[PDB]
Write a protein that binds this ligand. Structure first.
Ligand code: CL
Ligand code: CL
Length: 305
């Protein structure tokens, strides 16, 4: 039998990560026919947020691509990516990722058995709730789901909101049932998971980045013969490039599809409104500056300019 390579993730198929994973499957099976096959498991059908990294290290799955927010059990260094309003836009994110500090972060978990293979984009996060979030005061007392990140919890603490860490697979139902008031996510996730059907208002805040690290286990990666590993790595690189293109396309397409539905009201921030949000969030950077490194924050800030 060909060696089966399993790739699990938590998103819908028709998304940047969903498409990256399928492109990787296509390229491996084209270039190494009969030698390797890639099985892709979207929508948390095999492993979900809470168990995927444990599964990876057990070699129950060979590739995963978690949000950069979801690595705190293995390193505190990736917390930089969660800081609110650190990056102006995806161009700045990419520059930071491709610079020396960003490249070094790919190896931040290597002694824990996790090999960083590349960064894959999704997009900037927007707030949703059942009220406009024009100013920080509008979030006070509201319950927001967050990815399992202390930085993201602190982001909501900073405005007197109540953060709740929950796996991605639960978010739609939590919103639907009003167990939570709101959440934060990209247009692509908001559209593909139908969050906009159970939230009356989406505020275009662009207040943080949701990106991924594509990872494998050291044990699996070392178990490959070097020539086959090189072919697999090149296929992965090409799949990430395609996924990044899709990410940018979906960010525009899916915003428009949400607007077309007329089910959720878009809320835009004035410059002064945005600045109020920026200012109230800066203390989150101060809370984490030691763990993350002042030097690393400064490298990220400089990537904007
Ligand atoms: Cl885990
Ligand atoms: Cl929590």
């Amino acid at each position: 039998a060909p060696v089966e390579i399993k790739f699990s993730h938590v998103v819908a198929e028709n998304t940047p990560k969903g498409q990256m994973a399928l492109k990787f499957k296509e390229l491996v099976e084209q270039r190494l026919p009969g030698e390797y096959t890639v099985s892709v498991f979207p929508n948390s059908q095999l492993f979900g947020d809470n168990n995927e990294l444990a599964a990876l290290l057990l070699n129950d799955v060979q590739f995963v691509a978690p949000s950069l927010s979801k690595f705190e059990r293995y390193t505190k260094r990736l917390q930089v990516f969660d800081l609110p309003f650190l990056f102006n836009d995806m161009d700045a994110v990419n520059r930071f990722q491709q610079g020396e500090a960003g490249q070094a972060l790919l190896n931040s978990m290597s002694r824990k058995g996790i090999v960083g293979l590349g960064y894959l984009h999704n997009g900037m996060k927007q707030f949703t709730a059942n009220t406009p979030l024009k100013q920080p005061s509008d979030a006070k007392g509201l319950k927001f789901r967050v990815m399992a990140s202390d930085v993201l919890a602190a982001q909501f603490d900073a405005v007197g909101a109540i953060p709740v860490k929950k796996p991605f697979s639960e978010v739609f139902t939590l919103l639907q049932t009003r167990a939570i008031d709101g959440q934060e996510n990209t247009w692509s996730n908001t559209y593909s998971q139908k969050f906009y059907e159970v939230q009356s208002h989406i505020t275009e805040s662009n207040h943080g980045v949701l990106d991924y690290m594509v990872v494998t286990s050291d044990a699996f990666w070392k178990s490959l013969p070097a020539d086959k590993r090189k072919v697999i790595k090149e296929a992965l690189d090409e799949s990430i490039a395609l996924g990044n293109k899709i990410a940018a396309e979906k960010d525009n397409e899916d915003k428009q599809l949400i607007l077309d539905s007329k089910l959720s009201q878009l809320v835009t921030l004035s410059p002064a409104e945005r600045q109020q949000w920026v200012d109230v969030m800066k203390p989150v950077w101060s809370k984490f500056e030691d763990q993350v490194g002042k030097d690393v924050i400064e490298a990220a800030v400089a990537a904007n300019k």
